[PDB]
Design a protein around this ligand. Structure first.
Ligand SMILES: N#Cc1cc2cc(CN3CCC(Nc4ncnc5sc(CC(F)(F)F)cc45)CC3)ccc2n1CC(N)=O
Length: 466
């Protein structure tokens, strides 16, 4: 509107007043995305971007928020003439969605760093004419709600955002960019990406948000970071409370990554009487299994990261083996580079550092070490198996000799007598990839044959002539 009933909690003088606003909005038929995003971006601005003058909480006065809201609705209503796009069926057309996407896109500053913090909200859009990639998608959905287009909803993968709309909410449209130096496909469907079985489009098992999930998205999108070394405790507390509000109302049921975010917040500062972080990570994974065919990677990455921080080697390896078991049934496509980067960092940095510490601790007499547990060696092997299987049939390869050195080093952290105890069947482990099936021979020698490993992992045809 803003409607009279939306205004009665103002001014917001505290974290808990913001929470009350969210609770009130979530109790309405259609929570007001524009109002909520402006409020979050306002408080984020004054708690993370510019804390000059801060004494407790940046009071959000109705006059200030209403004026921001008016700037948004005036910009959208002036630019989008709904009479030019007649709505058949109480649903929107592709042309109308593209128009809204154009209006947001064309409003943005000509030149800015797209990867900077605090450019996610409508507050950034109105005051700085800056949005990040998924911020543009959110803004298009907020603009469509403001226009009365109840069918337009946010669609989310693990690295991208677009909208669904139209009859039965069955249409898809690109509304923002993806990555850096990819050609924009705004206006198009996502069918080619679903059909090529890329991770970016999750084989079609992406999130199709309702309004409540779009609220959850903006809450996950809060960025408490003040700088590299410093987070806003106020914004961490706000995000954590809003996530629990959403959780209690049922709106994180179909949002795996939000559960992982909340688990991470609880690890940092536990809320008395709430589920442990581990419980929450496992609920994230359950969500992915239940609603998204177990086709998501981050629920397992979140779990693994928690075990890695707690130096739980065994359970970190199991979770990373599970991440690889998901990825194996995708094709590695152009525009999947963020998930390649994650797997690369885990294989080539995180696991080696973890195993190096484990090796030192073993030398010092640790008992029950992952390095003496053949089931842990099997998890490491299943992690590599899934990466190798991922690469099979992909249009772009994954592995290269830069991975092989770390594989040899990681295998060698397990003594031969531990490695011997895994039974590789055609602990028991079965390999899905042809690369690992050929490597089986090499995996039990007391001294691993480094060169042969390297040849098998990279499928390098020849050794040096001279
Ligand atoms: N092990 C481990 C591990 C844990 C872990 C945790 C993270 C944390 N990120 C996990 C993903 C999370 N992303 C999200 N969280 C909620 N909602 C959304 S919707 C969306 C798509 C977009 F942006 F809208 F286009 C992304 C996304 C942002 C936080 C990143 C890499 C991680 N790793 C891999 C690593 N390299 O350490």
């Amino acid at each position: 509107g803003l409607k009279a009933a939306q205004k009665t909690l103002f001014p917001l003088r505290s974290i808990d007043d913001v929470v009350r606003l969210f609770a009130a909005e979530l109790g309405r038929e259609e929570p007001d995305l524009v109002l909520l995003s402006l409020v979050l971006g306002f408080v984020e601005h004054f708690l993370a971007v510019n804390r000059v003058g801060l004494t407790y909480f940046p009071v959000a006065d109705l006059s200030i928020i209403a004026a921001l809201y008016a700037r948004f609705t005036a910009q959208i209503r002036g630019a989008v003439d709904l009479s030019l796009y007649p709505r058949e069926g109480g649903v929107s057309s592709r042309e109308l969605v593209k128009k809204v996407s154009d209006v947001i896109w064309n409003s943005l500053s000509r030149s800015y760093f797209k990867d900077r913090a605090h450019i996610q909200s409508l507050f950034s859009f109105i005051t700085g004419t800056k949005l990040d990639s998924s911020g543009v998608a959110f803004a298009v959905v907020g603009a469509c709600q403001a226009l009365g287009l109840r069918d337009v909803h946010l669609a989310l993968s693990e690295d991208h955002a677009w909208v669904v709309f139209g009859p039965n909410g069955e249409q898809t449209a690109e509304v923002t960019w993806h990555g850096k130096g990819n050609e924009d496909r705004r206006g198009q469907t996502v069918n080619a990406g679903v059909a090529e079985r890329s991770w970016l489009y999750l084989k079609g098992s992406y999130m199709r948000c309702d309004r409540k999930m779009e609220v959850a998205f903006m809450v996950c999108a809060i960025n408490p970071s003040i700088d590299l070394h410093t987070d806003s405790l106020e914004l961490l507390q706000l995000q954590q409370k809003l996530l629990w509000l959403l959780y209690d109302l049922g709106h994180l049921e179909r949002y795996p990554m939000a559960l992982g975010n909340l688990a991470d917040l609880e690890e940092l500062e536990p809320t008395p009487g709430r589920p442990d972080p581990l419980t929450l990570y496992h609920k994230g994974i359950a969500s992915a299994k239940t609603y998204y065919r177990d086709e998501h990677i981050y629920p397992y990455m979140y779990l693994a990261g928690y075990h890695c921080r707690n130096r739980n080697v065994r359970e970190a390896l199991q979770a990373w083996a599970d991440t690889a078991t998901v990825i194996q049934d995708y094709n590695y496509c152009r525009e999947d580079e963020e998930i390649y980067k994650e797997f690369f960092e885990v294989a080539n940095d995180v696991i080696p550092n973890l195993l190096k510490e484990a090796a030192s601790l073993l030398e010092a007499g640790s008992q029950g070490s992952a390095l003496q547990d053949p089931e842990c060696f099997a998890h490491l092997l299943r992690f590599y198996d899934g990466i190798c299987k991922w690469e099979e049939g992909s249009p772009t390869p994954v592995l290269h000799v830069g991975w092989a050195t770390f594989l040899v080093q990681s295998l060698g952290r397990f003594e031969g007598q531990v490695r011997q105890k895994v039974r590789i069947v055609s602990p028991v482990l079965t390999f899905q990839s042809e690369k690992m099936k050929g490597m089986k021979e090499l995996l039990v020698a007391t001294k691993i044959n480094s060169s042969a490993i390297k040849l098998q992992l990279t499928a390098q045809s020849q050794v040096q002539m001279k």
